[PDB]
Structure 1
């Protein structure tokens, strides 16, 4: 593990799918979440369906083999490991939440943007309107934009 990915070409794989959403909507939410970050960095993300990916996206509940157990519905929503091999980079989403394309649950796209930020080495922001602020609030995903603080943060890590 370290502060940054030591390469700019980073693969991801969707390990399994939440039954809360259509699989194609999960694929789209995750693809768009990676795009948020590739839009403002030299990082390039590719989805793979076979083989070992850098960032594994997982839906799981309770204790799921990483010593950071999820806690049922509410509370912790998701977590991600910083850059590194193996579990490094991986992003886990609590299946006990109800994942949604928009609101009426926990929005997958917004949560994935936040978690991928961690996967890339970004920590939390103290600006409530940054996506890296450590609280979830739904915003219209159609008009979602990274805050200037988020852009500054990720560009500071990847020149």
Structure 2
């Protein structure tokens, strides 16, 4: 689908990378969802159920959906457009080193924020400073750009 047909979105962290403590991983995802909830009529509620709208997985190579990851670097993660089942789910390549991005590795917060963008129905931006730009660039500045917010309001008001 082009967008979620309900406003109360649920998510399930199905498994964890060992790269970061679980509480830090939980918080990275929470922060990434908080970014989008501030600018939408959507809420994001964590659940412990396979029935969740957005199922989150860490995996490597072929991990069960026919879109295999590729080892270190290259593809970092991917997420499916809104809908039932696999749709809306977000997967992270655990052959990457997940971090806070300041040091070595990729920021789990930034990559998750980007992927949740896709999971709400956004496509890519042509603005380098936008979160939904298709190349990863680590920044400590505010991730959202006018274009990101325009795109998400275009779908959700």
The two structures have a TM-score, normalised by structure 1, of: 0.96
Cα distance, 1:51–1:67 mapped onto 2, change above 3 Å: closer
Give yes or no for contact 1:89–1:120 (8 Å, CA) kept in 2.
yes
> Which runs of 5 or more residues in structure 2 are unaligned?
none
Give yes or no for contact 1:13–1:55 (8 Å, CA) kept in 2.
yes
1:127 Cα deviation (Å)? 0.2
Matched residue, 2:142: 144
Counterpart CA distance in 1 for 2:49 and 2:82 is 21
Matched residue, 1:13: 12
After the TM superposition, which parts of structure 1 deviate over 4 Å for at least 4 consecutive aligned residues? Answer: none
Give yes or no for contact 1:25–1:101 (8 Å, CA) kept in 2.
no
RMSD, matched Cα = 0.9
Give yes or no for contact 2:130–2:143 (8 Å, CA) kept in 1.
no
The two structures have a TM-score, normalised by structure 2, of: 0.97
Secondary structure of 2:134's aligned partner? coil
Once the two structures are superposed, the pairs formed by residues 110-129 of structure 1 within 5 Å of their partners are 110-129=110-129
Give yes or no for contact 1:21–1:101 (8 Å, CA) kept in 2.
no
Counterpart CA distance in 1 for 2:59 and 2:50 is 21
Matched residue, 1:130: 130
Number of residues of Structure 1 aligned to a counterpart in Structure 2:
156
Matched residue, 1:52: 51
Counterpart CA distance in 1 for 2:37 and 2:101 is 22
Of 106-115 and 47-56, more deviation after overlay is shown by: 47-56
> Which runs of 5 or more residues in structure 1 are unaligned?
none
From 130, 153, 156, the equivalent of 1:155 is: 153
